[PDB]
């Protein structure tokens, strides 16, 4: 049909060619006989007939006369549907500026004219004149005149010059300007400029003028002289049920425009005084502005409610505009809704659908099969049969729903498992019966939740429901490869109770012929489910081939584990059930079944697990009583002891031994300790207090307490909640967040009193208000992520890149937060993985690291694997299937046509409602030590002194992999020789946290340089030290001289010889900053390593990381590598000069010195190391360290937020969003290219342009990749439709109109807007043969 959408400015002739007549009157319809009035806003002569195939006068009344325009009424005899398509126009009596091109910032009229919006608005409002042309006059072009200046220069310099006011003046200025001449003038002005602010000004204006030259647009079309009128059926005036009329606000706004325009024409006919005509022109301008965008300029016009009228711009923008309410999502037919209940009998692929719902949802199918089977002669006979609900329409309904899936949806659809397809089973209720195992995917409970049903109509939709969306395809999560159709609550409690063992249970110690004998003995009441017993078990294993070989042996098992073995599929080991099965063990059992045997055994296994767990949770009788909340018998004395401690601390505070701060902190500490004591006593009295007799002798076993069994199986409940049931509730926080110093010593088994309950509600309401207010923030973040990543699709199979990220385990301090195996599983290697035994290929170059390769990496010592990433994919407009890796929902490599961007955005945004809206080194374990980035010297006391700020300590095991990683401050003295064994708890590093020491260069003697005493020093004596110290104070502390001039502590030999560096002849001196305390004099020897001077020192976070927000005061990084020097101080901006050795030397910054610097004048810096400290800005990380550094930073900083709440997301999904944030590139040197310098282009565009330029031997452009947040990256897309539908619709449509953009509909949103197959999924083939039957 069409292949692109173009947007541009409309000329007056274009606007008159859309129209079918001029709207000349504000009449809508006759009040007596509601036919539309001629020449009005509803006019059948302009806009089309109001009855289908009938004129207005009734003279031509049938399709016999079609297309004939009546000569009496002028109405064309045609369909009335044309009243939705036929526009009109208003010929404006005065030129009126378009408010979008004036007032949507930056102003296009202002930027094109290079006038301030203050001067343009003064001319528009008839307050000032502007000189269109100066002539033989001293007046420059566009010079603004007040009225008196105009009347002076008019009589003084005659009518040689031309000066006007109003939008006729602005229009004459926009018409009189030469765009190409001004482009050349501005370009040669750019070639004369070094000021980067003015250079940005000029490149903005140049690309505006160039967009106007390249487009067909003319500047003067930004001033309206003709006004389009929307078709009247899109602004309908319709009679309501009670005879009242309902209208659009556009009729009010259009009527006001017509009324002020007709009065302006009248006044120009009467030759009114010009104060009246200027007023009418201002009123027509503000009426047209209110029609186009109501509320931008001035106060919003309200009509008859004091509610502002909805303008044309409000129709298409916002959450309730066309795009977001009607185009990006719709209300659909063949859709129902009901409360969901549980069906525990259902199979995983089926739902229960009420017969009353299905009879309506499937109604044309039933009509078709009633007429087809001869049971109805006519669709109306069939309709009456279905109304009467004859007994045969239920048979017809049972055969029309037979293999026909339905989609079930629960809002909010946070991820794609919120829509799943099921085969319906017709039930008799009114409630949908949902399978239990899918509820966790839906986040559904049966406490009043509703779900929507949708009927797939076409064969393709039915086969996508069956093949893509069916719940038996959805057992693995797409966020992480973990099972998402997983047992819970009742199932895991039944499977846990079944697989537990009692000590002296009935039937203990017999020997069973198999699991069938165990079931016989349990059912006949001769053995207990927990009787530990000896069963002959035959288990099958897969050999090297796909063959399944059996082994039979007597296992020491229980009766219930033998019973549970009967439902386990064959390729699985008996050790998978020979344990008590909690939630984790059952999830791992399902994952094991999936990886070993595949999907068909796994869905059968999951159904059998559900049935068995339900059955044996029923058999258990597992109740909850009040005697199950066993309160520890020593809780009262723990509380009495903490009360005695708090009383003695209170008496200490009365006796002045402690101030209120440490007093309060001591009370908080002795109550947190007593709470931990009560919790440990409660859990110890709860977890094993089955004491049981084995042949007379008492023995302890794990407890069959019901509260404990629910908590221990992972069914429901944490230890933190058993603490509130049976322990004490503990310390509560004020709404301030500060802890109330008297805790709830009660639990819920005992009562809380009124005061305890009140201070518990303090935090209960805070949590509930967080839940209520963070869904909006998480939805907004997910929407921004989808709209930044929607266009990313796996388009290629392999891009042949060799880049990638080096995956290592995440180690923060001395904990391994993320192992290598789950950071590298399902990813394609980027280089051959080698053993510690060198040059032997362990894993070849393009291997997808499935579980066997990961076990091979784990049994070897591989600590780092370089893998392929989407940020390093070479594919233009997409991603190859190898840089992505596995589809985590399938378990194999991703397919071409997968919308991995929507999956990534949903995977990140789904857990957002589980996030919150509001010194020395102690090595843990044994292993070798190695340090990195060390500036190391030997102290006089047998030490290692690491005088650096980039060093880090790493603890290696005998395996060879780093297990702990710390990093130590400047001048941290090492208690260890680096490179050999340490022990657990062994202190390796000690330093000063609160003060920064100065550590010397080489051994020698103190010498002084530029420290003129009395002006750079206060020599102060500390009364109990014996030797006085010398302070180098602030700059305002002393007079001119040493305040800015730096004291330099030289080191020389005692014979006066300056000591020279090993390797360089660099002069050994130490320049120290102000606020320093020195304890040294001249003459005393100092070896290398003496410390001479001491200078003393949730969900919003993820949203800030993806928006790439620069923090409040960032870290300061070294742009270029070199040596530090200092320029103009004593302004407030300390001037740092990094001096390279082989580059262009001067590079300065303006560091405000109210942040402590962490660099010295003698030490070098690498590009990007911290000069000052603070939260790093990701733009700086990208510029100075690169793309891999900023993606490493963003994935680590986002997974720190997610791992803290126990949320497991693959970092494929964060790398997808990071790749979509690195989509632009600013050109630094164009070469022989079509780009300017300092111009932001797409990275793929400049990469393709360089591919073509180095294909023709010429030099391509050089660029610097930008980092944009997810809002600025999704607003900077090459598609104006998706950007305008995301947000800021006015800005997007304004820049797209003045630039003359064209949208080729290449992403998912633009094909959703326009009702096409998306270019992903099963529409990927269609778009491929749409583009190869267009490029041919």
């Amino acid at each position: 049909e069409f292949d692109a959408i173009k947007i541009a400015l409309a000329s007056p002739d274009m606007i008159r060619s859309w129209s079918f007549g001029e709207v000349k009157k504000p009449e809508t319809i006759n009040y007596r006989t509601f036919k539309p009035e001629r020449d009005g806003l509803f006019c059948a002569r302009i806009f089309g007939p109001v009855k289908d195939y009938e004129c207005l006068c009734g003279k031509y009344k049938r399709l016999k006369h079609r297309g004939v325009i009546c000569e009496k009424c002028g109405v064309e005899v045609t369909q009335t549907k044309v009243r939705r398509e036929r526009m009109g126009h208003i010929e404006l009596a005065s030129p009126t500026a378009h408010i979008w091109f004036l007032k949507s910032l930056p102003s296009r009229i202002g930027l094109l004219l290079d006038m301030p919006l203050r001067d343009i608005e003064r001319v528009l409002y008839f307050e000032s004149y502007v000189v269109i042309e100066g002539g033989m006059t001293n007046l420059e072009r566009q010079q603004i005149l007040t009225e008196e200046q105009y009347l002076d220069a008019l009589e003084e310099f005659g009518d040689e010059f031309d000066a006007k006011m109003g939008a006729e003046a602005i229009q004459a200025l926009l018409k009189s300007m030469d765009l190409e001449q001004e482009c050349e003038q501005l370009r040669e002005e750019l070639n004369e400029t070094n000021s980067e602010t003015k250079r940005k000004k000029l490149t903005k204006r140049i690309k505006l003028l160039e967009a106007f030259v390249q487009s067909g647009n003319k500047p003067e079309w930004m001033i309206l002289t003709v006004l389009p009128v929307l078709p009247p059926d899109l602004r309908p005036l319709v009679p309501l049920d009670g005879g009242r009329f309902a209208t659009s606000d556009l009729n009010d706004l259009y009527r006001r425009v017509i009324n002020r325009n007709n009065r302006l024409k009248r006044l120009l006919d009467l030759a009114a005084p010009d104060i009246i005509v200027r007023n009418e022109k201002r009123m027509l301008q503000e009426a047209v502005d209110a029609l186009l965008d109501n509320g931008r300029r001035g106060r919003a016009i309200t009509g008859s409610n004091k509610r502002p009228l909805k303008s044309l711009a409000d129709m298409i923008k916002g959450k309730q505009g066309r795009f977001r309410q009607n185009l990006l999502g719709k209300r659909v037919d063949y859709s129902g809704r009901s409360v969901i209940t549980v069906g525990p009998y259902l199979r995983l692929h089926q739902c229960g659908l009420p017969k009353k719902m299905a009879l309506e949802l499937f109604k044309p199918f039933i009509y078709g099969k009633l007429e087809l089977r001869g049971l109805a002669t006519t669709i109306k006979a069939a309709k009456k049969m279905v109304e009467r609900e004859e007994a045969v329409v239920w048979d017809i309904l049972d055969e029309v729903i037979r293999e026909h899936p339905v989609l079930l949806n629960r809002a909010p659809t946070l991820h794609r498992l919120g829509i799943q397809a099921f085969e319906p089973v017709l039930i008799e209720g009114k409630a949908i019966q949902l399978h239990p195992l899918v509820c966790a995917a839906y986040n559904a409970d049966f406490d009043g939740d509703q779900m929507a049903v949708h009927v797939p109509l076409t064969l393709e939709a039915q086969l996508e429901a069956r093949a893509l969306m069916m719940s038996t395809n959805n057992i693995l999560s797409p966020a992480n490869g973990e099972p998402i159709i997983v047992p819970s609550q009742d199932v895991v409690l039944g499977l846990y109770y079944m697989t537990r063992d009692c000590v002296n249970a009935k039937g203990e110690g017999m020997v069973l012929t198999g699991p069938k004998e165990a079931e016989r003995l349990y059912r006949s009441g001769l053995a207990s489910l927990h009787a530990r017993v000896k069963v002959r078990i035959t288990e099958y294993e897969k050999d090297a081939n796909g063959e399944l070989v059996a082994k039979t042996s007597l296992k020491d098992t229980t009766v219930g584990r033998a019973i549970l073995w009967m439902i386990v599929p064959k390729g699985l080991p008996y050790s998978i059930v020979n344990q008590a099965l909690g939630k984790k063990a059952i999830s791992k059992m399902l994952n094991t079944c999936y990886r070993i045997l595949g999907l068909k055994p796994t869905v059968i296994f999951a159904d059998q697990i559900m049935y068995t767990g339900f059955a044996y949770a029923a058999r258990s009788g597992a109740s909850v009583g009040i005697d199950d909340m066993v309160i520890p018998e020593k809780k009262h004395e723990i509380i009495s002891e903490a009360e005695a401690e708090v009383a003695e601390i209170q008496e200490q505070f009365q006796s002045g031994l402690v101030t209120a701060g440490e007093r309060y902190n001591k009370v908080i500490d002795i109550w947190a300790a007593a709470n931990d004591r009560v919790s440990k006593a409660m859990m110890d009295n709860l977890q094993t207090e089955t004491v049981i007799n084995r042949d007379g002798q008492e023995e302890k076993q794990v407890s069959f307490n019901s509260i404990y069994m629910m908590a221990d199986s992972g069914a429901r409940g944490s230890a933190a909640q058993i603490r509130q049931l049976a322990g004490m509730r503990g310390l509560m926080a004020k709404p301030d967040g500060s802890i109330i110093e008297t805790p709830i010593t009660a639990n819920f088994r005992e009562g809380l009193n009124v005061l305890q309950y009140f201070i518990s509600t303090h935090g209960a309401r805070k949590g509930l208000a967080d839940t209520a207010l963070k869904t909006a923030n998480s939805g907004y973040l997910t929407r921004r992520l989808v709209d930044v990543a929607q266009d990313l699709v796996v388009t290629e199979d392999d891009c042949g890149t060799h880049e990638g990220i080096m995956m290592t385990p995440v180690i923060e301090g001395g904990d391994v937060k993320e192992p290598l195996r789950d950071r590298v599983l399902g990813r394609v290697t980027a280089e051959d993985v080698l053993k510690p035994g060198t040059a032997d290929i362990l894993v070849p170059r393009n291997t997808l690291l499935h579980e066997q390769w990961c076990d091979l990496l784990e049994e070897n010592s591989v600590d780092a694997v370089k893998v392929r990433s989407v940020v390093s994919c070479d594919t233009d407009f997409g991603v190859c299937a190898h840089c992505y890796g596995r589809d985590l929902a399938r378990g194999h490599i991703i397919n071409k046509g997968e919308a991995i961007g929507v999956i990534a955005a949903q995977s990140i945004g789904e857990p957002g409602t589980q996030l919150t809206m509001r010194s020395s080194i102690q090595v843990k374990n044994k292993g070798s030590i190695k340090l990195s980035n060390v500036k190391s010297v030997v102290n006089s006391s047998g030490k290692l002194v690491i005088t650096s700020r980039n060093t880090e300590l790493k603890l290696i095991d005998e395996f060879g992999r780093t297990k702990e990683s710390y990093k130590v401050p400047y001048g941290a003295v090492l208690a260890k020789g680096d490179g050999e064994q340490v022990a657990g708890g062994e202190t390796v590093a000690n330093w000063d946290p609160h003060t920064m020491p100065v550590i010397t260069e080489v051994s020698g003697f103190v010498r002084f340089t530029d420290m003129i005493d009395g002006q750079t020093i206060t020599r102060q004596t500390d009364e109990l030290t014996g030797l006085s110290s010398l302070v180098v104070l602030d700059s305002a502390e002393r007079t001119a001289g040493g305040k800015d001039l730096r004291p330099a502590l030289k080191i020389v030999d005692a014979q006066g010889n300056d000591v020279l560096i090993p390797g360089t002849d660099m002069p050994a001196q130490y320049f120290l900053p102000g606020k320093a305390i020195v304890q040294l004099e001249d003459g005393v020897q100092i070896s290398s390593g003496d410390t001479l001077a001491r200078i003393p020192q949730g969900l919003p976070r993820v949203a800030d990381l993806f928006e790439a927000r620069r923090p409040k005061e960032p870290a300061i990084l070294a742009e270029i590598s070199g040596i530090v020097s200092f320029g103009k101080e004593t302004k407030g901006k300390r001037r740092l000069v990094i001096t390279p050795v082989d580059g262009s030397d001067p590079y300065e910054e303006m560091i405000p010195k109210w942040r402590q610097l962490n660099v010295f004048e003698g030490e070098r810096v690498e590009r990007g190391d911290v000069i000052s400290d603070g939260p790093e800005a990701p733009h700086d990380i990208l510029r100075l360290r690169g793309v891999h550094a900023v993606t490493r930073y963003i994935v680590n900083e986002v997974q720190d937020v997610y791992r803290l709440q126990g949320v497991k997301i693959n970092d494929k999904h964060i790398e997808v969003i990071v790749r979509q944030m690195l989509r632009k590139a600013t050109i630094v040197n164009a070469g022989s290219s079509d780009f300017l310098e300092g111009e932001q282009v797409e990275y793929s565009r400049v990469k393709i342009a360089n591919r073509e330029l180095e294909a023709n031997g010429k030099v391509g452009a050089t660029y610097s990749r930008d980092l944009l947040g997810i809002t600025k990256a999704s607003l900077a897309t090459e598609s104006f439709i998706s950007a305008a539908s995301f947000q800021e619709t006015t800005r997007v449509l304004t820049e797209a109109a003045v630039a003359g953009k064209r949208d080729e509909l290449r992403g998912l949103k633009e094909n959703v807007i326009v009702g096409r197959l998306i270019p992903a999924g099963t529409g990927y083939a269609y778009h491929q043969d749409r583009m190869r039957r267009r490029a041919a």
Binding site: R331, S335, T413, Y1326
Partner: protein
Amino acid sequence: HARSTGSYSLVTQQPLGGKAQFGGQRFGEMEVWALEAYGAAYTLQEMLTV
């Protein structure tokens, strides 16, 4: 509540809102993303157009 076909709005011709109006279910933006995350292009195209 269920609906196969029914009344439609005036300006946009989409189904009406509630079960009092015998209306359709809102297949909103997040459901469209859910269908785009599957490859359900034909299911989506019939939700949007037909």
